[model samples]
Target chain A: ALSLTADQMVSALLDAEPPILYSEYDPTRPFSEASMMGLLTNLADRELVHMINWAKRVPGFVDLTLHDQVHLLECAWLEILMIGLVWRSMEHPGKLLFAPNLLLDRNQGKCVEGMVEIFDMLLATSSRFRMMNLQGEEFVCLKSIILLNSGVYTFLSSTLKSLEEKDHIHRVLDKITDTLIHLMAKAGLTLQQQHQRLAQLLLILSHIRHMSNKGMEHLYSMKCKNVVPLYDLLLEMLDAHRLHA
Target chain B: ALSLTADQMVSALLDAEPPILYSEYDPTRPFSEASMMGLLTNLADRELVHMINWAKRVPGFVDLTLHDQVHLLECAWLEILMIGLVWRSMEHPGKLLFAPNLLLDRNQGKCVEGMVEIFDMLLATSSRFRMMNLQGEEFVCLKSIILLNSGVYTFLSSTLKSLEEKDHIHRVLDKITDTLIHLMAKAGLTLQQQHQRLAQLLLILSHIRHMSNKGMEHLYSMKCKNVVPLYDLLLEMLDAHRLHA
Candidate 1:
């Protein structure tokens, strides 16, 4: 947990094993109708764990209080996993290499409904990363560089720190919203304008709610549909996300 | 739709007979286990209709463009229905008169989980209303008076008018939230404060999402559990609420 230089962190990050997330994707049937989709889902579920493990190895990640480490991880584990997958695909042009053995090319079937949009994004990002010739050293260096700046991240990080407690966050937020309402009224905004302004603000906030809820929904569907076995890290992540007891 | 003086509007409102939402609720079995809870749910589903019918008759509600009127109704339907129920409970000191035949008191069984908090609020509101000796004439007058004032309600009413088409609202919102972010950064607030401030705003916004979503949740629970038969007006409201196709 000692503070490390960028090169030191990069060395530390590189020391970890190349992750093996999907253990059962049979190479003979990489494009099989049922299994490919299941493989993707299965790979995603396991990637969550590897991503969490890798994050903990980030030299100074554990330097923070344990709760702070956890609070940040829970909110962002999927995104980290997503970016890692994008990086992993960089070695193979025009293909998504989810695992060392499991590669999905552009010709893959559209098995998951409404999936083309997201798949296209990943492909686009992978292509973008490949163009930069983004090496592991720079990747780790950049991720580490942004990770610090303790003095500035304090506000949001502190808000995260405060929000773990129950009543304190609610009390603070209620006060803030009350102030927002007062400001709206003070400006002589009519009730309808106030509602519209609130609606617009709330629409943006709905994404935050949806990000967690929709992810929870995805987790449950995978669980209920028996597509993959969810691991402890994911459950803990969901538990921290407050989706489960 | 014609301009009616306050007294004329009052007569127009009073002439509509008092709502009879739960025709099957037997006074003798007012506290029965299954029937009472069902009656309450049944009453609510029907009250949604009566409330919509009532709002349309609000003198100037129809004076606006038809789309504008529908937009306003979809957003505020529950609230208008809520105030009406609160007003309906005024004559009865400690009970919520959800309908003429369906009355709930402090003595009612807590058949619905998480019912007491809401029930207590209704009881408190009814008690508050009784203290004012709030009359129909003044109630209608106040509700009618604020219903107009075009100079102010323009921003939101127009926002509503524009939002129905989709892309315009998203473009405007993206711009506004973008503006909000620019303002935050311009103030030299740390990244954390920007996040904290955004979180505060979003947390306030979550309630707006929850209001519609939770209401829809309530409606579906009642329907799926067979507690009530959802009618045309209820369905239209839900359709407008965008919960179903």
Candidate 2:
């Protein structure tokens, strides 16, 4: 198909009736369009060349430019954020949740559901938009690990710790247990602090690996007993997390 | 070794000199005496039982009480959070925009470092104090991911997005080619926006998961794809973001 330059596209986007982005009835429409254009525009060719050299040619996508990287990252971020919003607000669609349709009707609430959906969207979209190619599923899994490990543990610890003594913590904790325990009961399963931790860690790790073949050392350094079983459980968690009515 | 009863421990914690968690100079001291006690007491018999079942039994760990689940989640969260802060701050460490050993000598901000070191101590203490038989690596990796991710996506996205105007965005964009490129210039690997968004989402999900597993189902409906790879990149990005002195 014939194409216009980014400068042209920007003018068109800025001038379209009600803005082409708004006409689509989604906040992400502009983002998606922008991403595709940026991707096709070859904005980061030099950076790509540098990265290719930096990694010394590991047989794949080290060729994207610096501009391309930012746009891609932003696009990936925006896409995932949009998707997460949609998923959390609409209802879990792919058996990704343990309880189907828990947050189906509450699109406006910025609860945990909204957060998970947003984060997952970021993760999945980033993987899809990655410049280098091959086995997105595996790479995504690994990516999740990277994200899960760092995002949850690093940022949240102090806030969570601060809450340890409050009645709010107790109440919140109680509710969390009740909700999860009920689901486990249905799945003919039971919860274990250790196992839950394992499943979550694995799920996160798998998400990362599923993204790219990089950073296996950090992930591999993570000691666990049954890698095969953990992987399977993660798949199930992914499936369960996406479940809906 | 025989352990104190929950009630006795709780009382001792309450009655300790300066109320349990006064700061200390002992390198061997745990994260926080209070935090350590709290983590251990929270891992009740019921919680441990569930861990045993999860570690020894079926695929998922969905049956635990919400309180227990949240507790465990918090433990991991705190562990990782501290690790992430330390890992990221290690770049500056004692110096932190100055230099570590010299900064330490000047005692400019060694207290923060000291506090963080305690966090590492907390991680060890909490993991060791637990009766659950899951792998320690799971906990370690969980923290690693949490910190690693924070340094890249959470921290990076905030820094770049702060440069709001189109002119600045374009100006900065022109200087680098891809995430790696931008990261290289900034002295680290950069996170795509999508990945950062995903990290935030995962944080939200950790809590939403408190309510029910059905949230996953709601999540899947969005059809976002890069979840796995984004996480994998996070791991890689963590290494990339870290610059050597």
Candidate 3:
């Protein structure tokens, strides 16, 4: 086990984000079905690489068996990435800030068929983050919870929650919150303030809980729909259940 | 009229921008079709109160006869609000920040018909402001010019625009535009550089005046649909014509 303090653990958790750099996407390019889908696909592909690297570096993730880690990543990769998508677009209001400079407005999203619904769901969630003025600490904390939820409950508890797993899940969330609380204290937030924010931020997860299965099922459906071709790591992550076919 | 320097007049004009105080719309509201519209209607009401008071305090605004002031106010109230709306929202792409905490994104805009076109025009106007690096004094100058110039073209005469009044109005505009030029010079713009910028913003005002006429017409249509409640000053500003017909 690592000997890092809760404070130190948080620094690792918050700092573990993959570099947010996006491949060049000119928003002014003439809008076409090809260009729009290509942009979405390329963005997803870029995020997937960082998502893999980020999941590995997440504090306490080292404890998961390699097999366990890989399984959860495949199962909930779509949901996990949606976390980032929501975060990026929250500050952006009507558009998806796919890159620092690139934005996909709602009209722009209409070029592809299935993307609109996903974009709508994300924009709605993004609205929540906007009102709360979601801080970086809470974002990282919420992300950690999403990472573990997919493993312990949303994905695994469905296929796999034993009493031991349930209790550990509680402890895992507690530790994650503990780290956030400590960090928030250092960040000069009051206990009441931290408590208030955590409730608001964490409760947001219940709404997005459906986003997990729906994301996978949505991706699976999109593949069948011939919307946009999925490639590379994304193909493997999404196709895990399709092997029998 | 109160005596003040061009510098102080610009200050009065600039500072007269009403507190961007929101009427407390929840940013977390669920997507009820007209629910978002309710938020907008409420915000517009709040802004109108401040808009009235702010216009009164704007430098040299008092120089016009009370009748003349009210006439200009009624003639292009929507266009005037648009100037601030564009200013508040210029920094936010793809959305309109009607208040500091309240925003209406383009998708939320679709709840009502015709609002989308207005939203798009403002967003396009906002894009120009964003690229041009619209400074504060320039915003006041543009807004001052918007306030004074409304009586001539869109809503007024045919029935108005005599020679002396026209000259004074022209001088009124010249003073406002001159304030902007001096302001740009103060901000260290080169003599020619100020004219280059003034030309760009002057062109933008033409676009907004069309928006103004469209806004009045839009309100007229929405009144039939009974979309959202329109009351107080808004009712009067929009209903100047149904009086005779």
Candidate 4:
């Protein structure tokens, strides 16, 4: 741990597993299907564990009821993961940088029937974030807001026991937003620019949420049909209730 | 004011100005540029007012501090408007239903440089909403949730005076979502399907948010360049602080 700020901490965690986009893929040493499967599984497992640990560090998250904590994680990790992906993608154009060397362009994910659409959305989202010149702190603050917004998923609503607890979460949310605003002001933005930039950042979370939800749906369909064998931890995190296959 | 539930109230409000699509557009009667501009202005003005009034009815919204109320409205009205546009678009294909007679397709809005892109996104969002078979009640509930999520826009952080008020807002959100779930159950969806459906609806709001932000940017660019002379009310809402020309 380098004793970084919340935003820097977030970036470190996301970069724990290096993002290598499609452009960096080496054709000279092509990965066989089986080897590629292993690589993806390893990457997914590492990313999922990193996300769990990263979220645990969020103030008050671990203090919540075990059930609520899991429920929030279950509801939010994919969106967080997508946020991480978007940051890595900011440096690249027209592709998603997943691992240190695994960059995927639009058509590259077509092996799965519905994944191409999700990939396209992700690509578009990446470009939008890049266009905005999102800073490190902005990315993490947006991630926290998305992760902590427990009300969006109805399932979490049932488990959120008390108003007091919810209030605490909102206060934490307020603090995070404050930090985001402070960072913007530090960057020398005018009040108007800061507000516009802040609004734009929040709005981008919506797009990421859309992509995450659609991606989960695609995963569910694929799981049911066994069209793809998702990595174990990835599959586990996605199946919130362990309801289906 | 007739007696109505939250969902019903939302429908009545959005439908206050009935949205008629391109199917009702008569190409034989060519619209003069000035009249078309006036028509668009009238429609935009009406829709913006309708959104403010509609959100005012969302149980506890009016009780928030005046600054917070205005901030929420300024931040979310475009998204709420997009939700309305998506519903009207359910019956039409490849066109935005601005009014009963003023439907604009891709080429129709090409006079403005960046609008066609935003229009393309709106069309995509409309098609997705239609494909999901979104019910009227679901539409309203989702609209309320998007409209009332006060924390997403960071500028409101300072003005949100109390945790107790945030708690009140969340409880109201819970009620609306409960109504949404009840409708899904009434539609005979399975537990898994109900959760999935609710998640998908919330996720669509994210897409709308992205479109709203992008649309505002496009509007700002056009406004600065004097590409189109916008109505006073529309211009006012778009320019939160009236920062630029």
- How well does each candidate superpose onto the true structure, as a TM-score? 0.39, 0.23, 0.44, 0.47
RMSD of each: 14.2, 24.8, 19.9, 17.1
TM-score of 3: 0.44
Clashes of each: 1, 125, 1, 11
Quote the chain B TM-score of every prediction: 0.56, 0.20, 0.80, 0.76
lDDT of 4 at B155: 36
Q: Tens-digit lDDT track for model 4 on B97-184?
A: 8875667897877766666777777777777678678877677667777867633323312234655565565555555655666677
Models ranked on DockQ = 1, 4, 2, 3
Give the DockQ (2 decimals) of all models.
0.11, 0.02, 0.01, 0.08
Model 4 spans with C-alpha error above 4 angstroms: A1-245, B1-29, B32-39, B150-160, B224-245
Q: Can you write out model 3's per-residue Cα lDDT over A140-161, one digit (the tens) per residue?
A: 7778766765444322222233
Ranking by lDDT: 3, 4, 1, 2
Q: What would the per-residue lDDT of candidate 2 be over residues A3-119, giving only the tens digit for each residue?
A: 333233223322321100111123545543433212312322222232222221211112223322232232122122232223222233322221122222223222322233334
Candidates 1 and 3 compared by DockQ, better number: 1
lDDT of 4 at B239: 34
> Candidate 3's error at A7, in angstroms?
71
Q: Candidate 3 at residue A172, lDDT?
A: 61
**What TM-score would candidate 4 get against the native?**
0.47
Q: Write the per-residue lDDT of candidate 1 for residues B1-245, one digit (tens) a residue.
A: 23333345457656653365654655565344455556666665566666666656655454455455455455445444555666778788768787666677766636565555455655554554565354555445333322221111222322554434333323333333333444456667664454345434333232233233334444444533443333434445433433553
